[PDB]
Amino acid sequence: MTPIVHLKGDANTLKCLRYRFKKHCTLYTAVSSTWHWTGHNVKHKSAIVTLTYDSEWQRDQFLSQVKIPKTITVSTGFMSI
Amino acid sequence: MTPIVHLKGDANTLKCLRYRFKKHCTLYTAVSSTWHWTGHNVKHKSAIVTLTYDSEWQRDQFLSQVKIPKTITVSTGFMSI
């Protein structure tokens, strides 16, 4: 299994946060590209990033290791693979 | 909580599959945009789509309701929100 987190908010702030996490390459297993919810009226201003962890221990540390502004939503969970 | 699925494979086939699911608007809660894994040498040929369900019942039916070719990986799990 592999636990993952979801960061939703402004892509402008997310892009700047990813650059700061580059030095912390040992704080995650891998990072996906940027995606956003879709429906009608062409909605692509929002941006989200999928993050995966190698173990529940790495996810717990990442929670108290990386700082997140109030314009981002942090969600955690576990997926069966 | 909300269970979600991950479909990874060729974006060309995924785009055609999404069009066929348009008629089944009552088979999912919402659909995210397309994203792919990133690392080095510019990797963006792959494409994935995040799907969310309103209940474990909708996810189970979607498993035996939509057809998936062998070029796509199907993964299921539950996230705590």
Side-chain angles (χ1 to χ4, degrees), chain B residues 35-63:
Chain B
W35 48 271
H36 59 72
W37 287 122
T38 178
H40 59 110
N41 199 52
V42 181
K43 184 182 286 279
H44 59 114
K45 290 180 180 177
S46 292
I48 301 170
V49 60
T50 306
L51 216 301
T52 57
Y53 292 89
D54 198 325
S55 280
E56 181 180 340
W57 190 242
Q58 190 173 270
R59 183 180 75 178
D60 290 327
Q61 294 180 339
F62 186 92
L63 250 61

Side-chain angles (χ1 to χ4, degrees), chain A residues 1 4-6 30-38 50 52 75-81, chain B residues 1 4-6 30-38 50 52 75-81:
Chain A
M1 291 180 70
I4 59 170
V5 173
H6 281 313
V31 180
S32 316
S33 79
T34 304
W35 48 271
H36 59 72
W37 287 122
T38 178
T50 306
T52 57
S75 282
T76 179
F78 26 96
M79 292 270 297
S80 300
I81 304 301
Chain B
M1 291 180 70
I4 59 170
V5 173
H6 281 313
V31 180
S32 316
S33 79
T34 304
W35 48 271
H36 59 72
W37 287 122
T38 178
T50 306
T52 57
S75 282
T76 179
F78 26 96
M79 292 270 297
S80 300
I81 304 301

